[PDB]
């Protein structure tokens, strides 16, 4: 059929498999449905509507733009980065196809391409390892853009690359008064404090996300990690299983795909269920019920 042909033609340099069980490309004007679905909450199926609209227009420059960000928000970092790369090779001049291709690139701890992605992002800018040239070009220490969100608020990923969890904390704390409304940006200073111990004082910002976006699934993951680091197993497990439960909403009986992207999540209930000696779930709970 025409839909099947669309699927094999997508199965290309633009592979992005995304098992076809969603009836949203059947719905007309999917772009509007996509923008209206996340206007309140639940970016999960909003990312699905973005997939639906982006599936039949390969040349749509802005289709991949929000799709990459919303697929990075929902913790599925794997297919989102290759989708963003395919977006980048089409129009290789945009901050969105480079900023989200740099910070999310470090979640896999691939320090190689992150530096060149940062270089590409800083390219437009109309006005103990390699580091040196990239960091010097970045700098911009109150040179002519004091309190510049995209630069001053950002670039903490560079600090996170060097595992220097002392300068990043301040570089993010005194970077949120400007543009003081972005739940995703909160995560940027929500985990960098957690990674340097200090679990309690990094907890509040997590609830801060719930102040504006009570639909995030990565904030719940981060707070479960922090609680597990604090060895408070029971409610940590309860809240993380709530996080997986909220990760899939609606089309869930048919909303599954390759079932590898939600692997680490379906691993983190492990490494904890063996600490309170209950077990009894182990490999038996393999059906993701």
């Amino acid at each position: 059929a025409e839909a099947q042909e669309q699927l094999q033609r997508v199965q290309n340099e633009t592979n992005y498999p995304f098992e076809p069980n969603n009836p949203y490309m059947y719905h007309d004007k999917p772009m509007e449905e996509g923008i209206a679905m996340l206007q309140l909450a639940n970016m999960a199926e909003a990312a699905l509507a973005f997939e639906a609209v982006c599936q039949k227009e390969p040349e749509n420059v802005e289709a991949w733009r929000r799709l990459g960000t919303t697929q990075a928000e929902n913790e599925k970092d794997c297919l989102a980065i290759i989708a963003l790369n395919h977006a980048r090779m089409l129009d290789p001049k945009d901050i969105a196809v480079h900023a989200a291709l740099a910070v999310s690139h470090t979640n896999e701890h691939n320090v190689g391409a992150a530096l060149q992605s940062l270089r590409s992002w800083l390219l437009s800018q109309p006005q103990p390892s390699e580091y040196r040239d990239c960091c010097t070009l970045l700098y911009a220490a109150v040179e002519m853009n004091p309190n510049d969100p995209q630069l001053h608020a950002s670039l903490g990923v560079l600090h996170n690359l060097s595992h220097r969890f002392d300068e990043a904390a301040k570089n993010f704390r005194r970077a949120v008064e400007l543009r003081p409304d972005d739940a995703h940006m909160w995560n940027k200073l929500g985990a960098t404090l957690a990674n340097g111990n200090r679990p309690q004082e990094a907890l509040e910002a997590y609830n801060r996300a719930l102040d504006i976006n009570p639909g995030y699934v990565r904030v719940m993951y981060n707070m479960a990690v922090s609680y597990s680091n604090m060895a408070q197993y029971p409610l940590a497990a309860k809240h993380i299983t709530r996080a997986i439960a909220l990760q899939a909403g609606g089309t869930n009986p048919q909303g599954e795909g390759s079932r590898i992207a939600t692997r680490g999540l379906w691993d983190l209930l492990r490494m904890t269920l063996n600490l309170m000696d209950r077990s009894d779930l182990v490999e038996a709970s393999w059906q993701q019920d």
């Binding site: 970092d77 701890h109 691939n110 320090v111 002392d166 985990a191 990565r218 680091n229």
Partner: protein, 323 residues
């Protein structure tokens, strides 16, 4: 007939360990070196010395590290022993948890890359946080599929060296070859058993003075270097001897008795402890009980067991928060 990998050379402990291993290796051996940077430079230096039969191999790597390096997965072909010495230099402001947080991922990746091709091999972790870095390797081996409890060791002989050297000075004319040490490798999880040594003891009120100095010597060394160094020369020698013991046991030329941080399958309730073992042709072949102890050593092992237990729990509950 013996091939040894020194993964993590071209650096601190690694260079001295390789230099010491070049001399004591038996005839017909093969030494392989690896590092992200500097491997060819040291391979072109160790090959200019004499001695027949020893052959040196090396493999460089991409300057920005990448998972599952193609060079390492090809250099790991036909290797019997894997020494893992790859960490971070002791910067002043790193506390005690940042070092573990930065070393756990490196250890996991290196173990995965090495064991993905050659499962039947011994491991000789000498990273630094021995109490916590061994469970990570155990978990990686568990999830991969191949994991032998008899072929996984953690080097902790430096405590024995320190205890012997400190007990040989206050009892001059008398010399003893070795002193047992039980527990872990940290400030509090070390207890030297001084009631199992032949000869008279130098009374109390000084035995306790030596016992705490044994634990504090590491911080003493760190302070002596103006806060910008660590014990590297002494730590290198404590690894070369253990590696030689393992190699000789594997070849069948000896059956040594060593104290190593190894899994205690059964016996003690703590999953991991440093207790005497006897090596052989298949790694550890016979574990040994701790033995009789006095009433003043019973008030330290109880705390050591708890601290080791919580360290193992912390090492096994390692997770990464996504930014």
């Amino acid at each position: 007939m013996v091939n040894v990998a020194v993964i993590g050379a071209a650096g601190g402990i690694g260079q001295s360990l390789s230099l010491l291993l070049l001399r004591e290796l038996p005839f017909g051996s093969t030494l392989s070196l690896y590092d992200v940077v500097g491997a060819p430079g040291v391979a072109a230096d160790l090959s200019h010395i004499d001695r027949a039969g020893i052959t040196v191999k090396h493999a460089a790597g991409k300057l920005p590290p990448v998972p599952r390096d193609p060079a390492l997965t090809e250099l790991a072909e036909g290797v019997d022993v894997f020494v893992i010495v790859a960490g971070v230099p002791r910067k002043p402001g790193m506390t005690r948890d940042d070092l573990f947080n930065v070393n756990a991922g490196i250890v996991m990746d290196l173990v995965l890359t090495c064991a993905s091709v050659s499962p039947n091999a011994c491991f000789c972790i000498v990273t630094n946080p021995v109490n916590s870095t061994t469970p990570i390797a155990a978990q990686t081996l568990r999830k991969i599929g191949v994991y032998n409890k008899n072929k996984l060791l953690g080097v902790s002989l430096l405590d024995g060296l320190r205890a012997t050297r400190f007990i040989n000075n206050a009892r001059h004319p008398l010399v003893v070859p070795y002193v047992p040490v039980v527990g872990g490798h940290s400030d509090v999880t070390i207890v030297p058993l001084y009631s199992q040594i032949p000869g008279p003891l130098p009374d109390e009120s000084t035995l306790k003075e030596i016992r705490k100095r044994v634990q504090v010597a590491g911080t003493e060394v760190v302070k002596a270097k103006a806060g910008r160094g660590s014990a590297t020369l002494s730590m290198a020698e404590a690894g070369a001897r253990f590696t030689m013991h393992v190699v000789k046991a594997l070849m069948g030329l000896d059956t040594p008795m060593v104290y190593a941080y190894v899994d205690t399958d059964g016996e003690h309730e703590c999953p991991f402890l440093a207790m005497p073992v006897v090596l052989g042709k298949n790694g550890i072949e016979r574990r040994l009980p701790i033995g009789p102890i006095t009433t003043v050593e019973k008030e330290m092992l109880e705390e050591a067991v708890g601290v080791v237990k919580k360290n193992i729990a912390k090492g096994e509950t390692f997770a990464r928060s996504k930014l």
